[PDB]
Ligand binder design. Structure first.
Ligand SMILES: *[C@@H]1O[C@H](CO)[C@@H](O[C@@H]2O[C@H](CO)[C@@H](O[C@@H]3O[C@H](CO[C@H]4O[C@H](CO)[C@@H](O)[C@H](O)[C@@H]4O)[C@@H](O)[C@H](O[C@H]4O[C@H](CO)[C@@H](O)[C@H](O)[C@@H]4O[C@H]4O[C@H](CO)[C@@H](O)[C@H](O)[C@@H]4O[C@H]4O[C@H](CO)[C@@H](O)[C@H](O)[C@@H]4O)[C@@H]3O)[C@H](O)[C@H]2NC(C)=O)[C@H](O)[C@H]1NC(C)=O
Ligand SMILES: *[C@@H]1O[C@H](CO)[C@@H](O[C@@H]2O[C@H](CO)[C@@H](O[C@@H]3O[C@H](CO[C@H]4O[C@H](CO)[C@@H](O)[C@H](O)[C@@H]4O)[C@@H](O)[C@H](O[C@H]4O[C@H](CO)[C@@H](O)[C@H](O)[C@@H]4O)[C@@H]3O)[C@H](O)[C@H]2NC(C)=O)[C@H](O)[C@H]1NC(C)=O
Ligand SMILES: *[C@@H]1O[C@H](CO)[C@@H](O[C@@H]2O[C@H](CO)[C@@H](O[C@@H]3O[C@H](CO[C@H]4O[C@H](CO)[C@@H](O)[C@H](O)[C@@H]4O)[C@@H](O)[C@H](O[C@H]4O[C@H](CO)[C@@H](O)[C@H](O)[C@@H]4O)[C@@H]3O)[C@H](O)[C@H]2NC(C)=O)[C@H](O)[C@H]1NC(C)=O
Ligand SMILES: *[C@@H]1O[C@H](CO)[C@@H](O)[C@H](O)[C@H]1NC(C)=O
Ligand SMILES: *[C@@H]1O[C@H](CO)[C@@H](O)[C@H](O)[C@H]1NC(C)=O
Ligand SMILES: *[C@@H]1O[C@H](CO)[C@@H](O)[C@H](O)[C@H]1NC(C)=O
Ligand SMILES: *[C@@H]1O[C@H](CO)[C@@H](O)[C@H](O)[C@H]1NC(C)=O
Ligand SMILES: *[C@@H]1O[C@H](CO)[C@@H](O)[C@H](O)[C@H]1NC(C)=O
Lengths: 441, 443, 443, 441
């Protein structure tokens, strides 16, 4: 038969852990991913989150405390029986914050694979002679992701024809940043708890008495289980919780993004307007003038403000804190999983039975075409560049004003137009610092 | 590795043809389908649409006219090359309206498969002795679906322990119906164009590959209607391949608009029509399995299930669907609501106390094998709704049917067949040929 | 990307339980299943095994004794924890031998599904007027499979245009049989141990997790027999999960040995038994569809299909299978030969000339949906065998049945039912209850 | 339901093109891939073929000639319609022989992915402090594969703790080689033709008249289509041929291996005995003495002689040249596809209900456990080390004698015991030479 009648994607745990675990393709609306007939991509502007990593130091501290309670007791029973032959996956505390480098979901493998992939898809946009600059925010795991992606794309010519430019995450950069700063609630008050965690705590304690696990330990043990895939092919800890518990966990993580780095915080659109507006400039200037390939690397919390700025994936009302709002668009596993990315494709199209010859804008989020709301008149439900321009011009909030940015800091982004072509930053030249975070190499 | 990183379900054409083609499992929110730990289903109330069928007579007329234009020209080229060795799938015009009986997607096979399946899942709710009445609306394809489902469920004991009760589709039945009537003294549905820009691209591409057909955007619509129905009789359809992924996305949406406005939230009277079933089933839930019975298998149409969903206030778009463009992401995706053989199953859960709930009765809704959370009432095990809350919500929100629908005072004002039925098995097996284009029927 | 790099089919438990569990498509060599370009099937001769069933009475007795030991002990631990909420799937002992009627793998659902499927594939071979006789051996579960297949294929016209002919399994039928008899005046089969080392690992692991059952390697064998049969009545089996992948690999092989030696090439008389069908069908192929008829649907047992494969000289291990270890990679993998509902379909192809063959008649063999090349005779389109060569090969290699099997001269020496049959439809529907443990039957 | 009833793996084109195309997991007998309960791997000896590459210069010449005939004619029709918007995938002739670096099947991505994978599976065999040498035969694409695998496995410590040793392919190395030489028929006479190629030629010519394609052009166009995946995610050329044509093509390629580098040539077992015997030595010495990780890289034609030497996957009779011998064990897509590999795992097992405590040998070919014929008495159908030793000692042919190896050449392999720990060869330091073949860097 032609089509399968089973539809099981929704059950995947990959779509139920916020952005802690492995990358996954965003659920598609059914729109063909390749350029519509009569069109071709003439410019690409992408922002990819660092790949799969180890937990952060604070998350690791909490995971360790929960594991201490687990470990305070003879041979394990029930769903925790695997614990009799199991070792925590973080080599040592200095690895917290770093990209993973083992298993099918390794973060560096993610970046490399994505680069090789984009080479086939957009190779036609590089003549094999030009030196292409690529950009990374100044943070270890992000830089390492950028490096492996660039190496995947440029391959044999990575050393000579790709030029890594690292942009400081310091606020001093103002709007000339991949990680804009904004200074002057619900986010601070999140409990990270939902009733299903009580069921898990009760079930775990009952199978192996003596751990005194709370709903809070459950939350951290699930954070732990979701990060395990980033370093290993399978996680037995994932199996110690139920499908319904994972559904609640993913939602707890969705709330964090929504309120701390999304539409739940009204200043996020202004932060995301920096990239939204600067990229609009590149689209309007065109590939011949500005360049055809812009590969950017940053964090999950830098992509969500862009989506907010663009007005896409905006829940109709703020997400409720005490229950799962099923079906809302803010499903983080389809927005910013490890290695997630927003790719803006500029399409050069000839006339079609539904559109005039011209330039169109197409958005792709994690391999799935994301229609620009009601602007879907061009080929493949794209948006005519002129309409796209009026929409952003009319709706993007002002960054410096909204964010009280010092008049002495750069007021607009320049790196896409003012960059270096040297290749010294392409390869790492020093060990990964202990829990390395901010970095410029 | 543990999980696949590819997510392709959204591309399936089965989710892009409204309710014309084969049945498909509804896209899941991830909630476990089986009863939560500490719970068990003690009562089941299901309403299933007839299985996969041939087009209706009017649709067939249109399909045939479009095919005449296709056929008005030497060996076919391009994507229509398969037409050189292809025959329309409707045996003859008398088959329009009937359930299909060939291929992996055959309508009767769907019903029988669904019955065998429910036997394993809910067999514990039948003691092997009781004679269980099951209900079908008075329409040929619906009756045939009911019969095959019942046979799948009761199996060796279908002729003795299942009792088919057929409920007339006539308005004279008032609320004692599986297909309540509502007078039309009150529009967007009548003005639907069934057109979107992508159809122009298809027409242009088809005409260019095989000149001389003069196919229009309308012919394309009907040719797509035809392609979607083909799967109902055959395992593969090459016609599906003659249109692009983007064309199918538009077609599915054109079909969603029909349901939305003709049989859904787009028509404000649909909630009242659906309140009949919603309220009557609420009565069975509150009465309980011991008193009322534990198994209620009902069979009707797609347009009988959508008003129930509207009545319950689930899958309600935030705003009426726009007619001129695809409103991507809206909940009204018909391939996940009423595909051929689609169904809404209400499970009553008897649960012991859990770390998050008291011992008690809970209500779970399952639409096409996917648990459908009752909006904000998700406090019970498996995101279910406490029976008491479920009761207040329906009592507070269900519109009045007879009032809203100006039902004659002389017609039944209440549904009774779930309590007043026959246990004879005389209607279990078909006893006459399928009439030409058989629609309304009582056998 | 275009193709997946993961190849997991080999791990499926469906391919590791001999013929006890659900039907599965045979592993393909990659040859296209549909008729080659320039060809079409003009005649079909199929023999299908009864669908998924409950264990036999003797197997059930053994399963029950093993379960008694399991049950001789407080709440279950480890892999047997599910036993705290589990009930044996055989309703009562009178169900042993019967076709299953619940779950996605239900035996009757299998038959009905297969029929609907063949309707789309071979419908063109029935003009909608002719009354087609179909044949079943005289055994309850086989008859019930035949009936459901026929109903799936003929659908709306099953009661009028299909004619079930039931052929007695008695030896008195001689060669005019779907289940020929062969006297046993002549062993390895009788001495099979049904044991392999992995069963010791299972027993040890099970006893250690829940002490007090004293399960042996034999109990493990029967518990695995039980687990494999569970799928026949239910969608999932937790018992399957209590054994390792390596244990299942050994179990499947223990089952392969049974067929090999009791009903296969391991017994030199099986080719002669299978020659009856092989030769009679060759006659139909040579006679042609116009004269003999185009559709021959036959239903029998797994042990009736394996002798045919032996007679045809296909899937013959290079050496007899070793009894003490798994001979990995040998062609005698029963899950790819006779799983529940398994079938051998002979398609006669009428082909025009192709760049590699002359216009003519070719013979194609399909085993469980996979084209099975006739050894070195693969010169026709789609690796088929020219009818003339097929004829010489069978004529030259098929053993003589009556001689080899010492068949009384007073019994039919030739199969005739394909030419001498009834067209009445009286046997199409079951008219009495399924007898307790119903085996031989003529209705 | 628990299991799918559809079994479609056999139809995959990945299993129907000899060793020209993308890597694929070998079809499994069902044996669990992980170490049996009571056992653990204490030593790994692997030989992996270079990853996906571009055709060789000679193959490329032929592909080009066939494409010239295709291109000798207005807009393309039928199955070749994609040709109206298609470009050959070899950048320029200097790329022939090289590893691919684009698409999901890129050869370097293959190596990197495999390394990350083995890190999770065998990481426990490296203490994070030791410098592990790894070996590659002296050939460009093989060296590049070795490098990316080593980088995947050692990750952050690749520069310091992995030491690439490159072994010359010159015959002068004698038995101290990953590519032993042997000098003094059916192989030379292979036609590379089967009737199905006539059907394709006839069908292609009929759809686009004027190309005058022969059964020979068809063969080369299929060689071309199979190599296309190595550089791109999809190949439309694959779709221009039928399933039955691909079945014949794969068999034509199987014949080549069988007769030119397999059991069809009686000297192949002697060539493979070098590795078979040397590795047996490592197994008998053990991990504590010899080392626990041996990652080797060579060619497809170096792995087939090892399998021949071991007596595994030996057809009961020589493959017929004029027809497909369906079901024979010599299915190259399950033996040596691009990046294929033979991994020997030494298992240290405690006593089980079926075996004594001890050392066992397990063979894994392309992720599938390959039982050692009738020696399957240990856990997971493994072979007791002692039995494995007697079998090889009793059956391996003599290399130097059989192959008339000069007494002045090394008579036994030494590199596994005599190697360097320097890391200079770890990273490429010069451009990829035009059609680079033999290389020592
Ligand atoms: C495989 O790859 C992995 C990843 O690349 C490699 O792992 C990395 O290896 C790095 C070493 O090369 C290791 O770096 C060490 O981390 C230590 C912890 O740092 C954190 O705490 C301190 C103190 O609070 C903070 O200052 C710091 O910012 C962090 O928050 C550091 O302590 C180490 O620093 C010392 O060593 C480096 C040189 O290696 C010096 O440049 C530095 O100045 C320090 O030297 C002092 O300490 C050393 C002894 O460690 C003395 O010998 C030296 O004389 C100095 O001692 C003075 O100060 C100390 C107190 O610190 C005091 O005791 C003494 O009396 C003196 O006053 C160093 O930075 C990475 O963390 C690690 N990354 C990961 C992710 O694990 C791995 O090595 C590779 N494997 C192989 C086999 O190569
Ligand atoms: C396989 O199974 C299929 C499905 O059951 C059978 O097909 C049906 O066969 C019946 C006949 O047995 C067909 O019925 C015939 O319909 C004709 C057309 O009916 C329409 O038009 C009339 C007149 O306007 C209306 O009255 C009617 O409501 C319909 O709108 C009728 O003209 C026929 O009537 C004649 O025959 C009957 C007796 O059979 C007399 O009573 C009449 O007086 C008159 O002389 C007849 O009723 C039916 O349409 C078919 N259904 C389908 C879906 O095709 C096949 O026959 C069966 N195959 C075999 C070999 O048995
Ligand atoms: C759902 O459908 C199932 C399957 O059809 C029905 O179950 C069958 O029901 C029949 C009864 O209708 C059962 O038949 C009974 O079998 C008993 C045991 O038979 C064995 O033992 C006797 C004696 O040694 C042998 O002669 C025989 O060959 C068997 O080996 C018989 O003792 C019964 O006989 C009594 O009743 C009949 C009339 O019904 C009289 O003629 C007799 O003289 C005697 O008084 C009887 O024949 C059958 O075994 C069941 N099959 C299965 C698989 O369980 C269910 O009944 C049906 N459910 C409902 C609610 O209808
Ligand atoms: C948008 O960004 C571009 C590039 O930094 C800048 O030149 C331009 O002034 C910005 N426009 C607005 C309205 O901020
Ligand atoms: C709901 O339906 C039941 C059954 O028909 C009926 O008895 C009851 O009166 C109805 N309730 C309301 C409010 O209409
Ligand atoms: C083969 O079977 C046919 C049909 O029964 C019979 O007529 C014929 O004589 C048989 N041929 C041989 C050699 O037994
Ligand atoms: C035909 O019917 C007669 C009478 O019922 C029966 O005896 C005979 O066995 C039937 N023939 C076949 C081939 O079944
Ligand atoms: C096997 O190889 C080892 C390592 O090179 C060598 O020492 C030994 O002599 C060889 N044995 C035989 C029989 O050739």
């Amino acid at each position: 038969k032609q089509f399968s009648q089973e539809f099981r994607d929704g059950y995947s745990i990959l779509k139920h852990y916020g952005g802690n675990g492995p990358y996954s393709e965003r659920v598609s609306y059914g729109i063909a991913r390749d350029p519509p007939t009569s069109c071709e991509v003439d410019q690409v502007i992408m922002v990819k989150r660092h790949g799969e990593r180890y937990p952060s130091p604070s998350a690791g501290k909490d995971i360790e405390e929960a594991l201490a309670k687990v470990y305070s007791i003879t041979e394990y029973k029930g769903d925790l029986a695997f614990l009799n032959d199991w070792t925590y996956y973080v080599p040592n505390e200095c690895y917290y914050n770093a990209e993973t480098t083992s298993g099918p979901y390794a973060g560096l493998l993610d970046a490399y694979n994505h680069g090789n992939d984009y080479k086939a898809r957009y190779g036609h946009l590089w003549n094999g002679e030009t030196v292409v600059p690529f950009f990374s925010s100044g943070y270890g795991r992000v830089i390492e992701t950028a490096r492996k992606f660039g190496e995947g794309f440029f391959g044999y010519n990575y050393s000579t024809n790709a030029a890594l430019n690292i942009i400081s995450e310091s606020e001093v950069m103002g709007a000339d940043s991949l990680t804009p700063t904004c200074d002057t609630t619900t986010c601070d008050n999140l409990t990270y708890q939902l009733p299903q965690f009580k069921v898990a705590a009760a079930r775990l304690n009952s199978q192996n008495p003596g751990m005194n696990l709370t709903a809070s330990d459950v939350y951290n043990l699930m954070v732990m289980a979701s990060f395990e895939l980033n370093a290993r092919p399978f996680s037995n800890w994932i199996n110690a919780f139920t499908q319904d518990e994972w559904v609640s966990f993913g939602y707890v993580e969705d709330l964090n993004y929504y309120y701390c780095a999304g539409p739940g915080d009204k200043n996020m659109a202004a932060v995301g307007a920096v990239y939204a507006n600067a990229s609009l400039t590149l689209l309007n200037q065109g590939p011949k003038e500005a360049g055809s390939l812009f590969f950017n690397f940053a964090h999950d919390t830098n992509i969500t403000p862009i989506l907010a700025a663009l007005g896409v994936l905006i829940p109709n009302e703020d997400l409720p804190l005490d229950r799962v709002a099923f079906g809302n668009p803010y499903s983080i596993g389809n927005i910013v999983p490890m290695g997630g990315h927003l790719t803006i494709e500029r399409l050069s199209c000839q006339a079609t039975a539904l559109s005039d010859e011209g330039t169109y804008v197409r958005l792709v989020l994690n391999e799935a075409v994301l229609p620009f709301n009601d602007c879907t008149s061009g080929p493949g439900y794209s948006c005519p560049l002129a309409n796209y321009t009026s929409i952003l011009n009319k709706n993007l909030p002002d960054y410096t004003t909204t964010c009280n940015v010092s008049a002495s800091y750069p007021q607009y982004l320049s790196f896409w137009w003012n960059y270096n072509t040297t290749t010294e930053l392409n390869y790492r030249s020093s060990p990964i610092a202990c829990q390395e975070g901010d970095a410029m190499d």
